[PDB]
Amino acid sequence: MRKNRAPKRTVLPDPVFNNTLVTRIINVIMEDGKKGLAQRILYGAFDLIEQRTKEKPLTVFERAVGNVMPRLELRVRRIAGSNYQVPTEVPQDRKIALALRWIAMFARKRHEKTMLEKIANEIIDASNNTGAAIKKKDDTHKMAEANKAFAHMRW
Amino acid sequence: SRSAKKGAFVDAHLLKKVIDMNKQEKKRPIKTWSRRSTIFPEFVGNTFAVHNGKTFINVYVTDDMVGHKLGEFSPTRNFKQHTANR
């Protein structure tokens, strides 16, 4: 009942590593509209990644996001009682957006010290397929695999 | 709160009445409406009838009540017990 598809604004390439995902995750960890503070958090986390992993921070970040990045989504559809879920293949853009959102949400909840180290350690843990965003992706994947039967009927 | 250079405050009609009744031996209650007047040292020993809004409540000032406002020792609204709505 809208019959119009929304436009899309430019993502902008990052001006340090020339990787758009860096700008995307900056905007995701944005709070109170503080671009400077978000950029400081990201670059400090990347420097801590340099100090710890002894590898390229952009490569480590890509290895983390690609591993956290899900495949199936379960859409809620109620008919009579409760909701029976529906597995659908997601577009690549929404796939990346969900990966970044999960990364930030599970990074801002860990027990550690300053958010710099928080997000840095979350990224290094997700780089090895052992983390909280990993658990989230596993849970949604297993739920979709369980409710594979109703995949044919969507709406 | 009240400024220093300004000092205290009395309506001075109460002050004249207090001076007269202090010079007079057989003092009686002084019926006053001026709740804004502060209790001056010369007030000590007298009894006032302050207008609470309806009646004149009698307050006996002491060497201790010196400083506060005259109507501060009398109330204006009374509440003692609610009633159950249901």
């Binding site: - | 307050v59 201790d64 009540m65 506060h68 501060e72 020792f73 009398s74 109330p75 159950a84 709505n85 249901r86």
Partner: protein, 123 residues
Amino acid sequence: ARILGIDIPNQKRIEIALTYIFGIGLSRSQAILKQANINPDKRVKDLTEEEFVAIRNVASAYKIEGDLRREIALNIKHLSEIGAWRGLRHRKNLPVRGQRTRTNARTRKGPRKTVANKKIESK
């Protein structure tokens, strides 16, 4: 520590350990520190008897923390024994100042005692 009956934390700085005393706040603690010349940013555990006696002396010069509670109690009893409206308001456990008591001011009335409001069967 050594300041009267109060044991300030050993792993905290001096200008906050002084705040830990009842009669000493933060600004007054800084005032004592500056008057005694003892430099802040010095942990209390890494402090010596020479400063520990001077700080105690200046605190004794100031109003004792122990006598402050009885001073406040005496002042409230004084305000109540006059028959003041302020004393009466303080007596019945209600906001002393011109604070509203219609729908707020629970910090002086404690937990809410919910009652049954009026039954509305429409009119």
